[PDB]
């Protein structure tokens, strides 16, 4: 489960997920730093 640069892999849904959905979080996925730091 390697996915595109602006998404992370969710294990519950076995699917890759847009980082914007986690960005406002205290503890976002690491692979959403680069993308998530477009703000």
């Amino acid at each position: 489960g390697q996915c595109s640069q602006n998404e992370y892999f969710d294990s519950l849904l076995h699917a890759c997920i847009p980082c914007q959905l986690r960005c406002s979080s205290n503890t976002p996925p690491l692979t959403c730093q680069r993308y998530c730091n477009a703000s």
Partner: nanobody
Amino acid sequence: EVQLVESGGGLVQPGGSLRLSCAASGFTVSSYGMSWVRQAPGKGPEWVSGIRGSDGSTYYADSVKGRFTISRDNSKNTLYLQMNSLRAEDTAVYYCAKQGENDGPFDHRGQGTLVTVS
């Protein structure tokens, strides 16, 4: 505790439209981020649409922009996927899911509902 009871799948002819339901139990749909994911047989699950909990922003995969609309009815406490202008590759099991507090990880999903497009 928390459940997501889905309904609204079935058969529809190419070009048709369909409306999926995802009724929350044990929580309020308005209070969290929810999205829809789908899995066609032979393929891995695919994220499709989503509402961000923190600001109610809506998002859509490319394959589905212009045709699909996610929303919530607070009074019925359900998430919906309005699907228009359907096509053969929109055929999958559709799954709603819910995120933790403060745009957290997905913590629950519905049982699934089958959408078949001839």
